[PDB]
Amino acid sequence: AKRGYSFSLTTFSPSGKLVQIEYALAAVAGGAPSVGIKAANGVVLATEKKQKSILYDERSVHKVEPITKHIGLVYSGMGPDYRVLVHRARKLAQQYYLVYQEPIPTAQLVQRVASVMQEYTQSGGVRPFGVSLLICGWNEGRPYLFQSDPSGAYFAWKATAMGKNYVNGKTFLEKRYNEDLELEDAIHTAILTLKESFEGQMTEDNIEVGICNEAGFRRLTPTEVRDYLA
């Protein structure tokens, strides 16, 4: 028999800073690098999927996940916490569709998912999520890219990077990224930003990449990743 704690594990310090959120921000900042780019006619999301051993089955688990027909997810930080947010976001997407009979606007999903992240910064007996989410989507004939973080705050991006070397990844994108890209060009600059922080040689198994357009969201097959790696 058990009964949970009813007191907040995230409190205000004398400085006025919620320490556990910034500590959760350290968990994502130390995780594997991820990059997202909004490119006029579509969105691309890419991440480092280096399992650091040849024993692993690279096909079993995925980091780039679909939420619905038109929305995808990538993360930096902890895998287990990310899974919870995926399952919650998939349910929120269906809850919206059952009520309105319309594919959920990306901005509306991120708002609903970020609100779940907010709970774990105030609710009793729980720690915040150690994950920053990268949400892509297509609705009203327009590409969307969003960032959700442990705080529960959300930001809209043209292009951004998170995880290891997120500071060097962003400055790279400031110079490299230009508006009005083609989707196929966006995959290149996504892998290029990922190469800046890699360490090792890139194979189609070492990285994972998903794309979102007017035809919906899908993860690129290992054969498709190999062709861009040249």
């Binding site: 059952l98 009520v99 309105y100 009979q101 319309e102 606007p105 901005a107 509306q108 708002q111």
Partner: protein, 204 residues
């Protein structure tokens, strides 16, 4: 019948880049009439209207509770509601009371924001959506309204002619119903304007 208690008649029609919605103005309890200027058509935004026929309390309740959910939608979303989305919102609202339903059969009529496209639909008392390219009717004189609409409606009607058709369909169907009347209110919806008219209906 429970629907027969208060009565009422709501009708919607479709035309060339325009939609029309009309209702009777009667509020009455079984034997007698109380009010001549009762409202049954409610605006759910510019260029989108809902008409509600049935029990007067549930007519007012659904309209108020839908406005509650509509305003929250229009605030959370950064947009004005699409006609298909409103239909699904009413459908969800009514079905939530599956085994204790509001005794009203709603009619959505309006033009799609941005895309100009005309839209008309009617629903069950438990929220079953019905989309047509011509007309939808709801009330105690369903059969009378169906008989008029089937004979009068034409594929491509201009705002001038659509008003005349939807009026005559409402006028004569109401004159055969004992629980509907005391004036007819017609809304003609265009991109440029909205035309509101009360007609010289029978007051008996």
């Amino acid at each position: 019948s429970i629907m027969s208690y208060n009565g009422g008649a709501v009708m919607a029609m479709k035309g060339k880049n325009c939609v029309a919605i009309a209702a009777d103005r009667r509020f009455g309890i079984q034997a007698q009439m109380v009010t001549t200027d009762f409202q049954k058509i409610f605006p759910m935004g510019d260029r989108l209207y809902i008409g509600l026929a049935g029990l007067a309390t549930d007519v007012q309740t659904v309209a108020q509770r839908l406005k509650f959910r509509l305003n929250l939608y229009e605030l959370k979303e950064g947009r004005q509601i699409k006609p298909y989305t409103l239909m699904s919102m009413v459908a969800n609202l009514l079905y939530e009371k599956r085994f204790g339903p509001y005794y009203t059969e709603p009619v959505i009529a309006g033009l799609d924001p941005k895309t100009f496209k005309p839209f008309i639909c009617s629903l069950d008392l438990i929220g079953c959506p019905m989309v047509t390219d011509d007309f939808v009717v709801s009330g105690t004189c369903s059969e009378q309204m169906y008989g008029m609409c089937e004979s009068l409606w034409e594929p491509n009607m201009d705002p001038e002619h659509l008003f005349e058709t939807i009026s005559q369909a409402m006028l004569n169907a109401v004159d055969r119903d004992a629980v509907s009347g005391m004036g007819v209110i017609v809304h003609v919806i265009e991109k440029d304007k909205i035309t509101t008219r009360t007609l010289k209906a029978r007051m008996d």
